[PDB]
Amino acid sequence: KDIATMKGGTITVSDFYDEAKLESSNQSLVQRMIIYKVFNNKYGDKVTDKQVDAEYDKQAKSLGDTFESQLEAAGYTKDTYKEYIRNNLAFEAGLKAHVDITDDDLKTAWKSFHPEVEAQIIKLSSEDEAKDVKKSADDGDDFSKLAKDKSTDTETKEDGGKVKFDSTTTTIPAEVKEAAFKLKDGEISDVITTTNPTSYATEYYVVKMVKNQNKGNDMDKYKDQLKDIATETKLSDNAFTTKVIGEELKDANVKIKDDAFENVLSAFTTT
Amino acid sequence: NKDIATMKGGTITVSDFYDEAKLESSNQSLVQRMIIYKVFNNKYGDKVTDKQVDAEYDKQAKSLGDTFESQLEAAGYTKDTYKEYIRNNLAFEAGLKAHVDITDDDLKTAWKSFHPEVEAQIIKLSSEDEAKDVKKSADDGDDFSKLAKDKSTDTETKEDGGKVKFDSTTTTIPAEVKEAAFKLKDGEISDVITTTNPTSYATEYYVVKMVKNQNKGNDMDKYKDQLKDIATETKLSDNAFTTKVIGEELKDANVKIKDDAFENVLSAFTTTSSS
């Protein structure tokens, strides 16, 4: 009840509500809170604790030893950042449940798909460093040796910079996939400038092609994964998700009891 | 707690809303302001009257049209509730004012760029030719008042013969205008004057006739009441100032945050060790 007190006067949760319920930020909030609840009641069974754990783990290693404490900063606990993860997973489950892929959808996926290749990567923090490296590889230093000695991708460095990837591989920069796929077997890239998911990560890279793969004609060979890429595409359209969310709110018979949020769903329940 | 909404298996209560909202940064700031408002209201509230609330409401209302009434429903406010906001800011500023102790220096600064009240006439034109034409007219003769009535696009002043009274502090008059105006001797007509603003960006032109200029002289004591005013208004907008004052009043009110989720909400005002 009491959020704070002072000489003559108390501020309650109720007093806080009456103010907050006006704020735009809280319009958006109660919207999301309704959406999450509806999708959780419907698609929540499709999401497992294992997958929540998995997603937590993923993002945690991808965000430092400080993550634990970066959540204190964002007001979250562990168990409550999971709750957010569990909300997003059931949400996307729901969207996925409304995907019906078309021969067009597939064709679009295809047009820019590349199948899995084996390659070796050296990553450097400098431009000279990578320029210097490419000359080395030109001379004929063993790739794996240069990789072992130099690559700053500690992920791959001990293995001779061996990576496997396709057009969809997320951990690998776009400028890299771009250059790599061009290469014939045993051919070494030029230097490659890029940006990473960081927001400023201006890395450089050299690449050796181990096993390139041509995709051919009959797209049916890669139909299982084309279905996938295609599905991921739709899940990012707002025309799509708007519609889907629209449908599910209708399905769940959502009734706004507080006049203050009477308008909160209007973005969906409309023509 | 009340239900905010319901659906097939599931209710969202105010309580459920709270536990989520109390994390949001927006709501950090909110409970901050709400604590500050309450503290100043308990202390300086008597210094604010319903009349002054009404006054402030009225002011802003006429300054927005038939829009306003309905622009508040848009911002989630009622009339009764927008008043409560006005009453919160008035008691806030009351409190700040209560901590102003002006210095000889404060006054001196006010003085340095003060000009006392002058009587003048202003014609506003939306063209450059129009105003160039006008200045020749005033040069010829014809009553200033007449030219003002016929031409000035400032419907504010147009019916009065363009009579304005103002000083250095008058906000409704463009600074490039006050600049040119104060230079003028009595009965002297300005040159054309280009300027800005109005609707946050524009290019108006102005002609000015000086009716009664006033020199400020030496003894700054003559204008002590209004220098104190300018000075007071200056302090009320210093952050170092207001921070300190708000700091003090929270201390005075022995504010205790009962929900760990806002434990940090007053920290901007809790001055501590700095070496």
Author numbering:
A (entry chain B): 30 to 300
B (entry chain A): 29 to 303
Paper lines:
We previously identified PpiC as an important cross‐protective vaccine antigen.
We also dissected the role of N‐ and C‐terminal regions of the molecule in its dimerisation, an event which is predicted to play an important role in the folding of client proteins. Also, our work provides key structural data for the design of antimicrobials and cross‐protective vaccine antigens against nosocomial infections.
